[PDB]
Design a protein around this ligand. Sequence first.
Ligand SMILES: [Ca+2]
Lengths: 183, 183
Amino acid sequence: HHMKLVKTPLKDCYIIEPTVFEDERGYFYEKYNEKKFEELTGLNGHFVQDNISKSSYGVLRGLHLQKGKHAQAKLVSCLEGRVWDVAVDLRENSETFGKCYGMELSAENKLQFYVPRGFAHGFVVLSETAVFSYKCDNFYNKESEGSVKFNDSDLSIDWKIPEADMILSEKDQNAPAFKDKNY
Amino acid sequence: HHMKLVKTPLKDCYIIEPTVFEDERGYFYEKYNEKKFEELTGLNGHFVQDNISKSSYGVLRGLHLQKGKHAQAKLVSCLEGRVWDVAVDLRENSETFGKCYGMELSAENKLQFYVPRGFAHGFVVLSETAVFSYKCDNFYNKESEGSVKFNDSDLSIDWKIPEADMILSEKDQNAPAFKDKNY
Ligand SMILES: [Ca+2]
């Protein structure tokens, strides 16, 4: 019954590990519960928007964020296939400012990854195709968008797959460096 | 960009039709947006709990509800496979009291079904297995639970699959009739 939030090296960034109940017909679990989450973290647990994408192997999207009062906390998971998901703490006041953390999200492992406001976020598709789910605690605002180049040499993120396999949009190919502070 | 809610014969009960953008690598869509939903319906759009179940062909769960102040509106969809989903309006003051509506929810069709508070809900798995997602706008409360027998003769619900294929829990096999008012 208790929600299980697992610590990561980034402050306020958590893995939600599900408690899965199995039985004859299959399984069931409580994927998310706002009251439990807010009780455990003291953070906002009210999500207002749910987004879905399906992409093919090697598609890499990120690192993305919305600035200021438009910043979005994200609760992300993989509904089909496998992805490698990365978060970067960009809060200048945070003891983990400038640090990154990555993890595999898959339909099989049923994990969710909570990325606070003030972070940048991205992911790469590891399987033939993957369906990616992200819930946001704030609404879309194009003008507020910020970004960090995914392969910025200061962050030195390990995106796991061969570089020749990565598929990037023109925007993500041209995102400003971490030191340029487009956030 | 506009959310598309499609009317059903039951008052306040809607189908959410997604606006799916296809591209080279796949697709993306906004599955849910609380602000758009509340603007269109005048109803509460703040969901607080997300639940997942996976079940095998013929598993039928329902008809279920929570009574009184614990009643849960449900936004339901099928993430893998195919289900037949049914809602019953049980609000005594409603012009559609006692009426039912069923529809197929599948991973392929990406539809969502909004079941208001004061309704009972259930579904049966049509494919070999199915993964069912339901978001609730209120929290679980065991004591508040109500139920209606899925094959109640006054409601005469068409559950699509052969009765011999249906797999029901002991509780659902013994749910009180619609006219006994366990709600
Ligand atoms: Ca709250």
